[PDB]
């Protein structure tokens, strides 16, 4: 399973060709790692702003 | 020093009463131990001496904590006694 999984993920890695495209791609798409918790044990996410 | 100024340990006074704002500040600092820390850093305190303090404090806290717990548990039974002059 691990080898197959990595076999899949490898399609997506950054290479000498993808460099130009991928970089310009990532410069377009900001991501957040941010989220908060509630006293209940619940996750709260910011993107609803 | 490299942080932005005025965002920290800052209280804004309300309706111009300053004594109250200051009280609030002092409570903030007491609560976070900043006051005890400031006071304790005036002189140095050698490591063994500090070890001893921490241990004494924790003992003290355990005892006060537990005594308090027994007070609040026993508290019901302070009511007027039913059986008087039995």
């Amino acid at each position: 399973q691990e080898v197959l999984q990595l076999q899949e993920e490898a399609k997506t890695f950054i290479t000498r060709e993808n460099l130009e495209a991928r970089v310009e791609e990532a410069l377009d798409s900001p991501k957040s790692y941010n989220w908060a918790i509630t006293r209940e044990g619940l996750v709260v996410r910011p993107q609803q702003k | 020093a490299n942080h932005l100024k005025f965002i920290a340990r800052t209280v804004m006074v309300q309706e111009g009463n300053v004594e109250g704002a200051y009280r609030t500040l002092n409570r903030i600092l007491t609560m976070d131990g900043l006051i005890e820390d400031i006071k304790r850093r005036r002189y140095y305190e050698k490591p063994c001496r500090r070890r001893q303090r921490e241990s004494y404090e924790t003992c003290r806290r355990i005892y006060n904590m537990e005594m308090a717990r027994k007070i609040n548990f026993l508290m019901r039974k302070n009511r007027a006694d039913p059986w008087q002059g039995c």
């Binding site: - | 537990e66 717990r69 027994k70 548990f73 026993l74 009511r79 007027a80 006694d81 039913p82």
Partner: protein, 99 residues
Amino acid sequence: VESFASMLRHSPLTQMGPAKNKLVIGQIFHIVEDDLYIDFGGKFHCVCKRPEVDGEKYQKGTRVRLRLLDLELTSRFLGATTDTTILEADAVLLGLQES
């Protein structure tokens, strides 16, 4: 003849399971000013305060509805060999025996 085990197994006090949050029926056998001494039938009486609503309806002999928290209030404290008993039970007085 009924073996003790047989009795214990079917008793209402065994039926209850854990006594936390159980609705129960209890009866007031003693009063000091606001203090109602309620026997709900287990072991120790509990003691609750006379409510504000219909205060005079609570009299020695009355029956009331209780929410049982603890069957006996007991704890161990720092340095003690055994627990300490308050010799009381913990209950919340709900209302009186709606009937």
